[PDB]
Design goal:
The complex is a heterotetramer, with two copies of chain A (116 residues) and two copies of chain C (73 residues). Chain A is α+β, with helices and mostly antiparallel strands and 116 residues long. Helices cover 32% and strands 24% of the residues of chain A. Chain A has one domain: Alpha-Beta Plaits. Chain A contains three helices and five strands; from the N terminus they run ααβαββββ. The radius of gyration of chain C is 12 Å and the shape is globular. The chains are: A alpha+beta (116), C mainly alpha (73). Chains A and D meet through helix 1 and helix 2 of A and helix 1, helix 3 and helix 4 of D. The PDB classes it as viral protein.
Amino acid sequence: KRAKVTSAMQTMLFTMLRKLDNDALNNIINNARDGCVPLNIIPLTTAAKLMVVIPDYNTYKNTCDGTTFTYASALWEIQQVVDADSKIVQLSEISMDNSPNLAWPLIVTALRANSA
Amino acid sequence: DKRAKVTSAMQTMLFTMLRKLDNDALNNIINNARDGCVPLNIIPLTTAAKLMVVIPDYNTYKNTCDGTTFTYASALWEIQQVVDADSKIVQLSEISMDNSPNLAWPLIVTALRANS
Amino acid sequence: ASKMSDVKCTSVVLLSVLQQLRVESSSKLWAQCVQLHNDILLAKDTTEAFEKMVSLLSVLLSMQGAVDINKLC
Amino acid sequence: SKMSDVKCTSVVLLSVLQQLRVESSSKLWAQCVQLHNDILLAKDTTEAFEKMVSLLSVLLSMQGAVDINKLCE
């Protein structure tokens, strides 16, 4: 019974979240459905880092532009990108030509650009 | 303290949600409680199950009691006993408009749930 | 359907309100509250969910002096 | 309205995190509780939603604990 109650509560939670229809919540939810998930709690102050998994180039080009990462309705300055082999990836490498040569998924470490 | 502020906010939100649900049974027991007509035990859902309720005044009595039937929580209950504030039995013929000032209010009604 | 999510959300809040009122120290009473909360979460239709909500809410309404009803309303 | 719904959702979210065995003595749990408290005390939706983003991200960061696609079904 305990597993059914947990399933019911979690399903109701995301039904409630959908009905709220908030842009920031929908962004992190829909990103999570595509495998673009945070690795730590999303901070609201610039004095804390954020780490997010970027599963493929299609997601990368929809959220990243130069040193700026767009996520949770906010801007983040990228500090590090590491590939699936835990090797550092230069931002110049993450282009449309060199993308097949990268080891996806990538993990981006970023600092919040502005307060919430 | 801070715990009391959080508690107050949670309880206020709870009755806001309950009001938004707008269920007849919930509205009935909420509206009764704000008038002082409160249950003394968990409201049961099965036939012939026991229930005790405080009746604060004659106006509440007339709105909820008709002969031996008690109407409460969108259900019908079979009145077994009525006792006054001094735990003395009150016959139903005493509970009239002319005689109610002579009674030791509030009364406590004991009843059994009916069917359907 | 949409009211099913709302009533299930409200039942979680109601159990949390009872928990902060220290009903959990009463082992048997809290056990009944948890079971009612579980029955709402697993309710097939709104009729059953509201019937169980009547029982669960009556726990809060029966606690004399625990809350000021007319102020919270 | 959105204000009551957001606060109700935040109570459900903290309950969901509690059942997923987030240790009550951990730093993460104290952060979740503080966010939950701030949402309940929030006066406008902008503050509440920003805090809900942080609180919900705790659930989205727990890999293998929940499958979001099945819950959004």
